[PDB]
């Protein structure tokens, strides 16, 4: 069971990292804009918050995986 | 919902979902048909293999490429490729999600219409959009002012943009790409004794190209060094347990890019096309385009292409101007990485072409924004 | 002085002097080695027969071909052939006169160097030159604009020229020639009961091919006519007083030229290669090449090949365009007839490679003009 749950934790960590990469790329594009469309102004904030949430989720997942180890 | 972002290419198919960092599936765009009789009973007949299974069983198949030079020649094969991508590879029904496709600039009009019809009447997607390959690169790069230099298989094109105002008269297109380099590699490998003729042997030559090639900083000096000594030699192994030994041909294949007269063509090297594109724009924006060059496509993965590009452009361009070649890693997927970003954007979610719009307006709809 | 013009071929050797209308000597390029013990005393043990005497005593010899597919495989046998040609056959010492040789296009580099060394260090000729087989055909034909289609034993190649500017990227090469036809003739003669296995039996099959073969204008109708009636039957006599009776196989052997899928190959017929070569040149010169086609080599002596070639090319090529197949008689020696003419020309007498030039520059000399 220990090995299986460790594997599932690894998979979840991989998925989280994959999401972080895309969100960072989108924010990197959106930052350069100078007079963004009103919708983009809110989308930028939404993405900025989502990146944070994903980062703490990643920290928690890696901490749990290490604790199993 | 998630919007698929397929990139039908000239030599590979990359299909995936929006909001990702890599294509979900990647596989060659070939169709193989059996060549021999077939003697065993029970096997279960198959008219044609498609995708990677064809690449696996290349021994007894006649591989064909439905696309060439960006244009699409065979339509049944392309429809087969699309069906395989949507059902067998991605494993998602196409009805629920929209779709985003990419098409190279200056292509024939009819292509766009036929693609639209095949993506509405037969597959029944609720909304489809098509974008220029070069433009999507700048989203992945992360800037707005630049001159992309997408160089895929089949063709290579240059599209300069400034503050998000694409200049259409400075766009350039050229038909020198990886397939010509593969053919030249076969032709020059003929000298040492190794003779490759069949299509599968061409596939082997393509792998040889991918693994063992590089671009010399200077050409004549490299020839002199390779002729005098014997240090520029590499050994490769065929599937049949035979060893090829490549010498000069390591840097005579990609050199065709900068000297298109090897193949009998007449156009100028790619550095000259980039410089001409830059000098075909206005006077006030040339400095910015010099500052930010961009590379994309698989063909620009040769070790040392960035250095030679920078050196040649610096030699051609006036002094007092600073030139950088933004050449990030993982450039291979750069175009695709743009599309997913473009799909994610909230504003872009208003720019699709709904099915009823195409039903009412007609085929011309797609060209209104062309 | 007179300059020898030898044409080392893939299945025949033709050697002669300049300013003539035919080769002085012509003989097969084979080497026969004895197979059995030898019981009589006083005969004097020879180790290998060479040339025509081997063909005379094929009963108790194991005939071998030093050349294959243009490339030279065995070098001792080739040197023996050259020595026999210069001393026993021509009966002229090689020191006094220069020499002109012919080599097919796209062959390995090493061949040229080794031939040069064997023609300088060992035989000590005062000057040697080597020329492409296809080019010499145009001197014999009498024109300058054309697309030769030399088809010798071993291999066949196409070289289009326009105003004496050979296009190198349009050259085509293919490994379908008379030897494959002989093997196919053996394989299909197997059906009726006649079994030929040994090398001398292959030599007999080659004679059967030479005498009784032709090319049908259309294939399916010819097969139907041959099956329905019994008029397409011929009787031939073996050396052992036995009678073979050939039917359909009369026109299934040469048909392999236009349908290379009979022997398991994958390339296209020769008409398709000619059309592709023509359509790989520039737009403005295709008409002249269409007008003036040329054939050479022994393999193109099948009765009716010219008509089928013209019909196929006319069907493939666009209308409004006039096609002729210049197919003069005595085409067998056409290539050789070129060389002698090339030797005679006063200008050409400045282009040899003197012995001291090779001694100083080194082996690379020959390749400078390649
Ligand atoms: N690492 C590499 N080094 C050199 N050439 C490469 C490399 N990867 C791919 N290529 C060349 O690029 C071609 C594939 O291009 P691709 O990325 O499919 O362009 P597109 O997406 O427009 O079809 C291949 O045919 C291959 O010859
Ligand atoms: N009259 C003919 N009819 C049919 N085939 C022929 C004829 N003469 C020669 N051949 C074929 O051509 C071959 C000889 O080719 P050759 O003219 O020697 O080419 P090369 O000069 O390049 O060696 C022979 O093997 C034979 O099978
Ligand atoms: Mg691409
Ligand atoms: Mg010949």
Residue numbers in the entry:
A (entry chain L): 212 to 280
B (entry chain B), C (entry chain A): 7 to 376
Give verbatim excerpts from the published study on this entry:
The CryoEM density map of the complex allowed a complete resolution of the actin subunit in the F-actin filament, including its bound ADP and Mg^2+^ ion ([Fig fig2], [Fig figs3] and B). The cryo-EM structure also revealed the distal portion of the coiled-coil hairpin, which consists of about 1/3 of the entire Lfat1 ABD domain ([Fig figs3]). The structure revealed that the two α-helices of the Lfat1 ABD domain are zipped together by a stretch of hydrophobic residues, mostly leusines and isoleucines ([Fig fig2]). The ABD domain radiates away from the central F-actin core with its tip of the hairpin region binding to the site between two adjacent actin molecules within each strand of the F-actin filament ([Fig fig2]). The ABD domain embeds a surface area of 3703 Å^2^ on the actin filament, which is contributed by both the D-loop region of the n^th^ and the hydrophobic cleft of the n+2^nd^ actin monomers ([Fig figs4]). Several hydrophobic residues (Y240, L241, and L244) located at the tip of the ABD hairpin are accommodated by a hydrophobic pocket formed between the two adjacent actin molecules ([Fig fig2]). The hydroxyl group of Y240 of the ABD domain forms a hydrogen bond with the main chain carbonyl group of V47 at the D-loop; the amino group of D248 of the ABD pairs with the carbonyl oxygen of G48; and the side chain carbonyl oxygen of ABD Q254 makes hydrogen bond with the main chain amine group of S352 of actin. Moreover, salt bridges are also observed between R236 of the ABD domain and D27 and E336 of the n+2^nd^ actin monomer ([Fig fig2]). In the Lfat1 ABD and F-actin complex, specific hydrogen bonds are formed between the backbone carbonyl group of D-loop residues V47 and G48 and the ABD residues Y240 and D248 ([Fig fig2]). These hydrogen bonding interactions cause the D-loop to insert slightly deeper into the hydrophobic cleft and induce a unique conformation of the D-loop residues G50 and Q51 (*Bos taurus* numbering, equivalent to G48 and Q49 in *G. gallus*) not observed in other structures ([Fig fig4]).
